[PDB]
């Protein structure tokens, strides 16, 4: 769409940044070797973990 | 004599062309401005005069 | 969601709006040609009458 | 952590730099074409009275 | 027409791009500095059309 | 920083200079074709004198 095409060159990166987060988000899980590392990744598990 | 009749048509469209050509390009020029938008132009249906 | 409404409303798609600009660009050149040439004929007739 | 949150948004990211890099280049080009299109009218304009 | 006004409007459009490029090109060229940061800019518009 | 800024305000750049030169070329061409009209008016005056 007309101006959206301006937003879209961002949206390309915006969609990319989502994967950018994910790959590393995995990496700390790889580095941690754990299902989760944050309290809000799965609290129910987190409370259970505690 | 017929010239001044010719002159009228030479005025309305021809002069407006400069503006319309310029303005739309300017709209295009402003298209990259941080907040520009769809500011556009329109014609009007004028009167009819029997002569 | 609220994006799509405005950036639809917003504008900014240069290729199409340029096209009409171009034929307007042609328009004023075209008219004057016809206007002047008739006037030249008019001027011609004026000289004829002289 | 306080590192991470500055890292979350602060300096350089390939796709961000790449995307804008392309965009302005395209923008620099769109302007060049139309400006030359303006130039072509100078000719038409002059021709009107030439 | 006073076409010349539309020119610097057109030039300014190229001015916006080139500076905006310079902002990002700086980022690419000077990314690694022990400290380094983004920058950004705004655009504006000047005069009425040929009314 | 300091070297960059002063250089900006000083010398030679077509992007600014050439733009104004193209129009100047048209500016002169319009001038002479205007003078062509008075020449034609001058021709008319000469014919009248004759």
Oligomer: part of a larger assembly
Shape of chain B: elongated
- List the helices and strands of chain B in order: H
The largest sheet of chain A is: none
Our Rg estimate of chain B from Cα atoms comes to 16 Å
Helix content of chain B: 55-70%
Distance separating the two termini of chain B = 14 Å
Terminal residue distance of chain A: 49 Å
User: Structural class, from helix and strand content of chain B?
Assistant: mainly alpha
Strand content of chain B: under 5%
Number of helices of chain A: 2
Strand content of chain A: under 5%
Number of helices of chain B: 1
> Would you list the SSEs of chain A in sequence order as H and E?
HH
Can you count the beta strands of chain B? 0
Radius of gyration of CA atoms of chain A, rounded to a whole number: 17 Å
Shape of chain A: elongated
Overview of this protein structure:
- Chains C, D, F: This is Flagellar hook-associated protein 1.
- Chains C, D, F: Belongs to the flagella basal body rod proteins family.
- Chains C, D, F: It is found in: Bacterial flagellum; Secreted.
- Chains C, D, F: It comes from Campylobacter jejuni.
- The structure is cut from a larger assembly and holds 1 copy of chain A (50 residues) and 5 copies of chain B.
- Chain A is mostly helical.
- Chain A contains 2 helices and no strands.
- The termini of chain A are far apart.
- Chain B starts with a helix and ends in a 21-residue tail after the last helix.
- Chain B is 57% helix and 0% strand.
- Chain B is mainly alpha-helical and 51 residues long.
- Classes of the chains: A mainly alpha (50), B mainly alpha (51).
- Chains B and C meet through helix 1 of B and helix 2 of C.
């Amino acid at each position: 769409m007309r101006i959206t095409n301006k937003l879209n060159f961002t949206n390309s990166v915006n969609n990319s940044m989502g994967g950018q987060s994910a790959l590393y988000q995995i990496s700390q899980q790889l580095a941690s070797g754990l299902k989760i590392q944050n309290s809000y990744e799965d609290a129910s598990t987190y409370i259970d973990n505690t | 004599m017929g010239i001044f009749g010719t002159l009228y048509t030479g005025v309305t469209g021809l002069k407006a062309s400069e503006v319309q050509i310029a303005t739309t390009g300017n709209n295009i020029s402003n298209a990259n401005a941080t907040f520009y938008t769809r500011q556009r132009v329109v014609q009007t249906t004028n009167g009819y005069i029997t002569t | 969601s609220v994006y799509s409404e405005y950036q639809s409303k917003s504008g900014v798609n240069t290729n199409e709006e340029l096209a009409a600009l171009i034929q307007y660009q042609s328009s004023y050149g075209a008219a004057a040609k016809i206007v002047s040439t008739v006037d030249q004929m008019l001027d011609t007739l004026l000289g004829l009458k002289s």
